[PDB]
Design a protein around this ligand. Structure first.
Ligand SMILES: NC(=O)C1=CN([C@@H]2O[C@H](COP(=O)(O)OP(=O)(O)OC[C@H]3O[C@@H](n4cnc5c(N)ncnc54)[C@H](OP(=O)(O)O)[C@@H]3O)[C@@H](O)[C@H]2O)C=CC1
Ligand SMILES: NC(=O)C1=CN([C@@H]2O[C@H](COP(=O)(O)OP(=O)(O)OC[C@H]3O[C@@H](n4cnc5c(N)ncnc54)[C@H](OP(=O)(O)O)[C@@H]3O)[C@@H](O)[C@H]2O)C=CC1
Ligand SMILES: [Cl-]
Ligand SMILES: [Cl-]
Lengths: 218, 218
C-alpha cells in the first residue's frame, strides 16, 4: 500500500505476563469483587504496576501524584496522545463498566464488539461506547472514520486481539513483558490460524520492572 | 542460602517464538527427514538463526567461517564456557541422536531423563550421555556432582524445563525472544502449577533479530 504512512495505524499495546497471559485465572465477573480468589488481584497488580507508576498516567487517571518521569513515561504519553479511537471486547467492557470511574479513561469513541444489542453509552470526558454487532471489520471501519489523523487502538482483551491478528489487521504490536508468571488465565497467542501474522522487532526499551517490546507488521 | 554463590547455578537458555513455543508443529521423528511438513524446518531455522550467525558458535560447531562478533557473540561464548553438565529430555535427545555430529556439541556429561533403561553413550570430544530413570531431582544431583565449579544447563525441551520450573530449581532463565509466530508446537510455559516461579529482570540485550532476556530467581 503506497499510502500506508498517511493512514491511521491499528495498534495493540498490552501488558503480558512472562508466560503470555493478559489476565490471571479467576479474574472474571464472578470473582471481580473477590481479588483473593486464586490470588488474582495480586497477579493483576503485578502486571499493571509499571504503568500505574508512570507520572503521566497517574495524572491522567487521577491516581495520585509523583511517579516515574523517564523514557517509559514519555512512551506511555505518546500511546495516549496518538489514539483517536479504541476497539474492545465485551469482557473487557464488563470489567470496566464496574471498575472505571464515571469519567472513562478513553476520551475517544470506543467500539465494543458484542452480540448484545445495546444503545451507545455516553460518559463524561468525551467517551462514548458504541456496541458493534457485525464484527471486527465493521468496528474498524467505524473506528478509522472516527480516528481522523490519529491511530486506532485495539484495547483488548485477548479474544478481540486474536481476531484482529487473524484478519491481518494489526500494524503494530506493543508488549510490556512483565517478569510475573500467571500459570493460567487468558492467553494472548491462542486460536491463531494460518496464514499467521509476521512481525519484525522495531524497538526495545528496557526497564527494571518491564521490558517494552515494539513489533511492526512485515 | 548464604553459600549460593559457591554453588553451581541451574539455568535455562532457550530460543522462544513470540507466541511462546520452543518447537514448531511437525518437528517429530516421523518428519525429521521431511522439513516441509507443516513448514517446520523453516520455522525452526527462524528460531535458531541468530545463534548460528555468531562467530563463536560457527567456529565451535564447525558450521563455517566468519560470523557476528559483538555483545551477542560474547554472550553465547559465556553460555558455552560456563557449563559443566547438561540435563535434557528424551525427545530432544532423539532429535540430536539423528542431527548432532559424531562429536556432540556438549563436551560435558549429559543426563537424559527417560523411562528407557539404557547404558551410557560416549561420543568423541568429551560428551557422555547417561539415561536417568528416577526423575529430575536425581538427574540434577548427578549433574551437580559432574559439574564441579561450573554451572548446570537444563537444555530442554519444554517438558523437562517445566518439571524444573515446577520444582523451583531454576536459578536463571535466559530467553532469546524471536519475532516469529509459530501458531502451535511445544509451548514452554504450560503445565505449571502454584507455587509459581518468581523472577526479576536482570538484563536485556536487544538485537535486530532477537531480544535477549535474562531473568534471575527472586
Ligand atoms: N493485560 C492487558 O494489557 C489487558 C488485559 N485485559 C483483560 O482482558 C480480559 C478480557 O479478555 P477476553 O476474555 O479475551 O475477552 P474480550 O474483552 O476480548 O471479550 C470477548 C467477548 O467480546 C464479545 N465479542 C468479541 N468479538 C465479537 C464479535 N466478533 N462479535 C460479537 N461479540 C464479540 C463476546 O462476548 P459477548 O458474546 O458477550 O458479546 C466475547 O466473548 C479481562 O480480564 C481484562 O482485564 C484487557 C485489556 C488489556
Ligand atoms: N527452542 C529451543 O531453544 C530448543 C528447543 N528444543 C526442542 O524441544 C523439543 C522437545 O521438547 P519436548 O517435546 O518438550 O520433549 P523433552 O525433550 O522435554 O522430552 C520429554 C520426554 O523425556 C522423557 N522424560 C522427561 N521427563 C522424564 C521423567 N521425569 N521421567 C522419565 N522420562 C522423562 C519422556 O520420554 P520417554 O517416556 O520416551 O522417556 C518425555 O516424553 C524438540 O523439538 C527440540 O528440538 C530443545 C532444546 C532447545
Ligand atoms: Cl453480553
Ligand atoms: Cl452494530
Amino acid at each position: 500500500n503506497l499510502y500506508f504512512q498517511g493512514m491511521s495505524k491499528v495498534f495493540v499495546n498490552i501488558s503480558l505476563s512472562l508466560d503470555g497471559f493478559m489476565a490471571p485465572e479467576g479474574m472474571d465477573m464472578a470473582h471481580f469483587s473477590d481479588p483473593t480468589y486464586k490470588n488474582w488481584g495480586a497477579k493483576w497488580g503485578a502486571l499493571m504496576a509499571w504503568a500505574l507508576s508512570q507520572q503521566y498516567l497517574r495524572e491522567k487517571l487521577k491516581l495520585g501524584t509523583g511517579g516515574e518521569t523517564g523514557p517509559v513515561n514519555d512512551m506511555v504519553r505518546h500511546t495516549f496522545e496518538r489514539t483517536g479511537a479504541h476497539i474492545m471486547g465485551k469482557r473487557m467492557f464488563e470489567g470496566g463498566e464496574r471498575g472505571w470511574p464515571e469519567e472513562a479513561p478513553f476520551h475517544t469513541p470506543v467500539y465494543v464488539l458484542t452480540h448484545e444489542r445495546r444503545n451507545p453509552w455516553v460518559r463524561p470526558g468525551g467517551t462514548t461506547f458504541y456496541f458493534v454487532n457485525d464484527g471486527p471489520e465493521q468496528a474498524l471501519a467505524l473506528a478509522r472514520e472516527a480516528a481522523g489523523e490519529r491511530d486506532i487502538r485495539i484495547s483488548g482483551g485477548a479474544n478481540v486481539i486474536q481476531q484482529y491478528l487473524n484478519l491481518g489487521l494489526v500494524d503494530e504490536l506493543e508488549i510490556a513483558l512483565i517478569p510475573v508468571i500467571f500459570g493460567g488465565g487468558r492467553r494472548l497467542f491462542e486460536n491463531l490460524h494460518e496464514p499467521l501474522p509476521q512481525f519484525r522487532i522495531d524497538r526495545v526499551l528496557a526497564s527494571p520492572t518491564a521490558t517494552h517490546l515494539r513489533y511492526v507488521r512485515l
